[PDB]
């Protein structure tokens with residue numbers, strides 16, 4: 094190991110992009126988001142210029158609450174040797190997520206968990222950079238006992254023990270060189286959400302579809318759930334542009350009650366969607382299973398997970414057979430540590446993982462987790478695909494590289510969390526240039 | 535209606551009590567809590583001197599994060615006519631809990647929901663005071679159609695429609711005068727948690743038991759789950775002091791994994807506990823059902839709910855038959871509005887409600903909800919009891935009145951949320967007298 098240094102400084106800033114003024118990103122539930130992030134930077138006393146950068150994604154308002162919670166957690170990482178953190182990553186994870194007082198404001202959900210993901214993302218970035226490897230490669234090269242030492246198994250040993258996790262990782266060693274070669278040569282298959290958004294005229298939507306088809310996209314998501322006639326109008330346009338052999342996914346962003354989701358989907362089934370994403374509340378495990386049993390006979394699978402708050406919810410979704418596609422999120426769960434536990438549970442249950450992405454930097458982070466999944470955990474692309482959105486990559490130092498609608502594996506050390514300091518400063522809320530122009534004093 | 539005024543001001547303060555230095559309040563999970571609250575005060579332009587006071591309870595660190603989230607929600611209540619809020623309480627509830635951007639930092643869980651409960655508590659206090667009635671009486675006297683108009687049924691219409699809620703409330707009209715007379719004459723039955731805490735010597739625990747027995751207590755809770763031998767030592771002392779005919783409840787505060795909870799409880803079953811509270815994660819619905827099926831044959835019921843984040847979790851706990859006793863919390867759920875939806879679901883499923891209380895002012899608030907439950911919803915005391923803890927009532931203007939281990943119904947207008955301004959100022963964190971002495975600058 095090349096790990097060194099004591100964590101000496103932490104900064105956290107409220108960064109907001111005015112995407113609600115751009116006209117893209119509206120869904121049936123979040124009709125006016127301003128893609129934002131709590132951006133964390135940690136420094137060591139190593140004098141090597143290597144910094145750990147971390148993010149968590151928000152929709153604008155509430156980013157200041159996340160920043161507050163990052164400040165509440167900061168004393169746990171400050172003045173700690175990085176060797177001591179990475180040497181007992183499970184222990185450090187438990188101190189952040191089960192703090193005897195702070196856990197009351199979660200536990201492991203909402204603001205406090207988003208803040209925990211931002212801090213832990215900065216530590217994974219720092220560790221991967223000191224090791225001179227992208228996070229996906231750090232994970233791929235990790236000894237299975239070392240990897241399981243980073244994971245907290247509390248509340249999931251009833252479906253996945255440490256021993257079960259080791260067995261999946263040992264099996265994942267077989268053909269790992271061939272799978273890493275495959276990833277470097279062709280990338281991780283993606284779908285586009287760039288034609289999905291609510292509010293587009295017919296002409297606008299036809300233009301976005303034509304451009305995506307021309308650019309090589311063959312898998313498409315569409316937002317639904319506010320207005321059935323509008324959903325039929327937009328699904329008709331997309332399905333006519335893309336043809337019957339191309340993949341169409343629908344996303345209701347939690348709009349419906351359980352019987353309502355079945356009824357609405359019975360009317361949209363003519364568009365032959367591969368899946369219906371978030372048909373109801375992200376907490377309703379039994380609800381997702383009820384909708385899944387009703388719709389799998391129509392040939393429609395259920396997808397959920399982007400707002401699923403922790404591994405206990407994912408465990409029950411797998412236990413209840415509530416979903417056909419499990420959608421991890423790099424910044425909703427407890428960073429790499431908790432995402433690893435969910436990848437391992439999904440393989441244990443033989444359920445495909447289709448990551449959520451988009452927002453501010455979710456593509457940049459989550460691509461590492463799913464490349465690692467392919468090489469070392471599931472060893473398959475069957476029924477698996479990574480979301481992609483064409484937003485805000487110009488603000489990242491290491492933006493995602495898409496080739497033939499595929500994620501090319503990041504080459505640089507780190508978790509691709511690092512933002513351009515000029516971008517951070519212009520978009521800092523409330524005093525950055527952009528917000529002084531949009532909300533003048 | 536006597537409702538008037540435009541909400542003109544809102545204040546929120548971080549109030550913390552140093553209960554970790556007192557030696558009481560430790561459990562197996564939260565070993566050093568400082569009972570605290572985000573204290574909200576709203577004023578109107580009515581010039582009647584009536585203010586709405588609200589709280590949400592925390593364990594100390596993280597109260598400043600809740601205060602931040604109250605500030606994020608404040609613009610929704612400021613400059614609003616109280617008539618417009620109480621006239622469409624469902625609509626106002628949806629704007630606070632499904633704000634198109636703020637809901638991303640929950641939704642309806644963690645910090646953002648605790649903050650929502652604090653704001654909504656201040657509005658219920660204000661409304662009940664302008665009507666010159668304690669909240670329990672405001673609810674009892676409310677027309678059933680008016681009461682259901684205060685409740686958001688999203689994600690629960692599959693188990694409880696508006697029509698189903700109306701049917702339960704219409705039935706609850708029968709014998710309501712007789713039940714209100716019963717409440718005023720004898721109060722709501724309570725149990726004490728004052729002998730429950732971890733860290734007590736044998737002598738100390740025997741002294742607390744003897745004093746509680748002398749004071750008339752006959753129902754006792756005990757904390758368990760950190761150390762089996764310590765649990766056997768303390769359960770033996772309590773069971774020997776109180777005898778076999780008195781009620782003993784155990785509370786593991788989420789310590790265990792599912793198989794571990796069954797094994798640990800098989801060893802404590804000799805103490806004949808009525809229930810085991812929070813045996814595992816407050817999110818694990820399927821887990822609570824697994825433990826319930828294993829333990830109900832030993833004569834031990836499962837209780838949970840104090841950290842259950844919203845009505846969707848309670849709905850699934852009822853659907854899965856995961857619990858024998860449902861524990862509502864006045865400040866974890868979305869204030870009176872969401873607690874009403876959970877009381878109505880528990881009656882629909884014929885499951886007894888045993889409120890959680892203690893902390894800072896939870897006794898003062900939750901007593902209104904359970905008195906209302908008895909008079910207008912469940913119409914029974916069978917298998918039902920309210921928690922009581924002897925902490926911090928001297929800091930409330932309207933402290934709970936206990937007579938013969940029973941909650942005597944509050945007589946004064948409001949939700950009993952109002953704190954003594956001298957108490958708030960001395961305990962304000964970080965600049966109140968107490969915190970300047972404990973954490974000098």
Ligand SMILES: [Mg+2]
Nearest residue numbers: 344370371399
């Ligand atoms: Mg989605």
Ligand SMILES: [Mg+2]
Nearest residue numbers: 466467473477
């Ligand atoms: Mg894969």
Ligand SMILES: [Mg+2]
Nearest residue numbers: 785811812840
């Ligand atoms: Mg409890």
Ligand SMILES: [Mg+2]
Nearest residue numbers: 907908914918
């Ligand atoms: Mg009752």
